[PDB]
Curated annotation (Swiss-Prot):
Domain of life: Eukaryota
Compartment annotation: Nucleus; Cytoplasm, Cytosol
Segment of the intact protein contained: 458 to 485 of 1237
Organism: Mus musculus (Mouse)
First and last residues of each zinc finger (C2H2-type): 8-31
Organism placement in taxonomy: Eukaryota, Metazoa, Chordata, Craniata, Vertebrata
Residues reported in the UniProt entry to bind Zn(2+) 6: 10, 13, 26, 31
Tissues and organs where the protein is expressed, per its UniProt entry: Detected in spleen and thymus but not in liver, muscle, heart, kidney, brain, bone marrow or pancreas. Expressed in CD19+, CD4+ and CD8+ lymphocytes but not in CD11b+ lymphocytes or peritoneal macrophages (at protein level).
Function statement: May be involved in transcriptional regulation. Overexpression causes down-regulation of a number of genes involved in the immune response. Some genes are also up-regulated.
Name the record gives this protein: Zinc finger protein ZFAT
Length: 35
């Protein structure tokens, strides 16, 4: 995982999450970042 901390943070809205999956999926739900 990441170095230090207890969670992962959005690069867009700077919100914190319990996991890298909870972060990855947040971006698709509200920032709409597709492929
Ligand atoms: Zn965000």
């Amino acid at each position: 995982g990441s170095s230090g901390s207890s969670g992962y943070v959005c690069a867009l809205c700077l919100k914190k999450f319990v996991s890298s999956i909870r972060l990855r999926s947040h971006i698709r739900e509200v920032h709409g970042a597709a492929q």
